[PDB]
Amino acid sequence: KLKLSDWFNPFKRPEVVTMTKWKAPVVWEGTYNRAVLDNYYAKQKITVGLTVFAVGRYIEHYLEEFLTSANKHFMVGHPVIFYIMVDDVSRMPLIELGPLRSFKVFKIKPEKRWQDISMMRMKTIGEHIVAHIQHEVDFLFCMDVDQVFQDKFGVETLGESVAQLQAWWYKADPNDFTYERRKESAAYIPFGEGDFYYHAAIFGGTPTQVLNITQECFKGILKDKKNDIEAQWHDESHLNKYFLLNKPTKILSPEYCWDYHIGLPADIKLVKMSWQT
């Protein structure tokens, strides 16, 4: 089956990191053959799930545009299930999906104290993986709703565990990274240690990887709640801890998640996804 040479060529992008000291492709525009993989993956009849939580104001601010963009650019030409998690199914924008997309919607409870987090997405995702997603898909992406697909976000992103380089900090040094530094947090990453700064707005992998990613992240949040402590960037900090203990088998370039208000540096040749309004 697939080997990296078949789909991935680092030397079409030599400026940027394209491989990692543990041999994981960092996927950049111009570095990947979608055609090959589209073909390779279509034969295996893979199915890609996309979870996205949207809660309160976020539902009407973002969901419609998310699902619409996804419908157009996410794993085009492969079955894709959108798992929409919302607090209020009444205001589900409920767009028109195209070939190979379908969705499942789930009512989630809002943030239950007082004031929760609210990620808690980690517990729900893992719950859903066990209940149905492991049965439903070969690869699952978990994404923040307040983003937009700008171009093909395809099977070049697929892998055992897939992480996204947060746009700001992709050039940064490991010790500039906004990891949780407080040794009391389960999310704790020493200064010194640190591979990349991973964005929580997109992680993915097989349902089994993602189950573990999420179960570990949640255990982190949970132990932190027990120690009345709250990681700097909440779930993104645990993700970063997790992805340090467990190196992602594939990493996506800030091109797969770009903040347009960080500009447009040459290094960003096609924007697959971007943050919104």
Curated annotation (Swiss-Prot):
The UniProt annotation places substrate binding at: 53-58, 144-146, 166-169, 178
Cytoplasm found in the keyword field: no
Annotated cofactor note: Binds 1 Mn(2+) ion per subunit.
Cofactor(s) recorded in Swiss-Prot or TrEMBL: Mn(2+)
**Which residues does the annotation flag as glycosylated?**
212
Instruction: Return the EC number.
Output: 2.4.1.87
Membrane topology reported for the UniProt record? Single-pass type II membrane protein
Predominant subcellular localization, coarse grouping: Golgi
Q: Where in the cell is it found?
A: Golgi apparatus, Golgi stack membrane
Q: Which GO terms describe its molecular function?
A: glycosyltransferase activity; metal ion binding; N-acetyllactosaminide 3-alpha-galactosyltransferase activity
Catalyzed chemical reaction(s): a beta-D-galactosyl-(1->4)-N-acetyl-beta-D-glucosaminyl derivative + UDP-alpha-D-galactose = an alpha-D-galactosyl-(1->3)-beta-D-galactosyl-(1->4)-N-acetyl-beta-D-glucosaminyl derivative + UDP + H(+)
Q: Which family does it belong to?
A: Belongs to the glycosyltransferase 6 family.
Described purpose of this protein according to its UniProt entry: Synthesizes the galactose-alpha(1,3)-galactose group by catalyzing the transfer of a galactose residue, with an alpha-1,3 linkage, on terminal lactosaminide (Gal-beta-1,4-GlcNAc-R) disaccharide borne by a glycoprotein or a glycolipid. Preferentially glycosylates proteins, can synthesize galactose-alpha(1,3)-galactose on glycoproteins but cannot synthesize the glycolipid called isoglobotrihexosylceramide or isogloboside 3 (iGb3).
Instruction: Please give the name of this protein.
Output: N-acetyllactosaminide alpha-1,3-galactosyltransferase
Q: Which organism is it from?
A: Bos taurus (Bovine)
Placed within the complete protein, the shown segment runs: 82 to 358 of 368
